[PDB]
């Protein structure tokens, strides 16, 4: 018989998933992931199960995957997604439960960067690694590790590109992912979806989303702001295309940067980056390589 799901006992219940459930599981003895979807979530586990599979994709800051298996338990086939398993779970839980320090803040935005940056970069050569860009990041999908850095994670979304053609591996569907975090091109539906760039750069405007959501934990001197989620004081808990639409679209409002953060280097350089992935013109944003530079240069000095 099979050798990867046989051997994975569940032992706790960690939450649904956009598709599936999810729960830790343990393999060898180490705890993992399991994501687990019904046979007729077939095409999600199948596309999420590839883009894992991505030649070259691992590296320190995206989830490590393990593997894709079948289950039967004697009545039905389960469909299984195996990965790394990080107690901490989402930068969302994480920034909900606890306050960073400046150097906290700076590991887990530069984490999250360098994590992109390697996403969106196409590496050339025969064990080549196309480019790909998320369509669902926010706090919820990136998870931080032990180490107080973070791994990009829920990849199902993702679409790869060939630099070649210019063209996308599957066809896109307008406005996927999560509402709050979409940015104004794809909520307006002015997005050019042939154009790989645009969702590169529709990435990056959510990063900027979840480098808010970290700042606003970053205390000092004791000092910080509430956990909050980007657009709290303005859109309703679960909105709608219409209702995000309407305020980052037509009355161009951003999430709001406090005063405070003008006080401290560090909090100066990240209330900048934002405004550099805020903007309305995808073109005029910063891209993660640029973001990972900036950074890195923080975390040096």
């Not at 850095?149 to 999560?178: F, K």
């Not at 709050?180 to 750069?201: G, T």
């Amino acid at each position: 018989g099979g050798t990867i799901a046989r051997t994975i006992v569940l032992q706790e219940s960690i939450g649904k998933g956009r598709f599936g459930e999810v729960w830790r599981g343990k393999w060898r003895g180490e705890e993992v992931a399991v994501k687990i979807f019904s046979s007729r979530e077939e095409r999600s586990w199948f596309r999420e199960a590839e883009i894992y599979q991505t030649v070259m994709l691992r590296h320190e800051n995206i989830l490590g995957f393990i593997a894709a298996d079948n289950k039967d338990n004697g009545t039905w086939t389960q469909l299984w997604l195996v990965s790394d398993y990080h107690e901490h779970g989402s930068l969302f839980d994480y920034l909900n439960r606890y306050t960073v320090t400046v150097e906290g803040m700076i590991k887990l935005a530069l984490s999250t960067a360098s994590g992109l940056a390697h996403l969106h970069m196409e590496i050339v050569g025969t064990q080549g690694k196309p480019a790909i860009a998320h369509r669902d990041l926010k706090s919820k999908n990136i998870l931080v590790k032990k180490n107080g850095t973070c791994c990009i994670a829920d990849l199902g979304l993702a679409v790869r590109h060939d630099s070649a053609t210019d063209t996308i591996d599957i066809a896109p569907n307008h406005r996927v992912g999560t509402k709050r975090y979409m940015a104004p091109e794809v909520l307006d539906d002015s997005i050019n979806m042939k154009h790989f760039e645009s969702f590169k750069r529709a990435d990056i405007y959510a990063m900027g989303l979840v480098f808010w959501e970290i700042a606003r934990r970053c205390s000092i001197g004791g000092i910080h702001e509430d956990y909050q989620l980007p657009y709290y004081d303005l859109v309703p808990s679960d909105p709608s295309v219409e209702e995000m639409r309407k305020v980052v679209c037509e009355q161009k409002l951003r999430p709001n940067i406090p005063n405070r953060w003008q006080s401290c280097e560090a909090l100066r350089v990240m209330a900048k980056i934002m405004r550099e992935c805020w903007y309305a013109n995808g073109a005029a944003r910063l891209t993660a390589l640029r973001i990972k530079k900036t950074l890195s240069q923080l975390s040096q000095q």
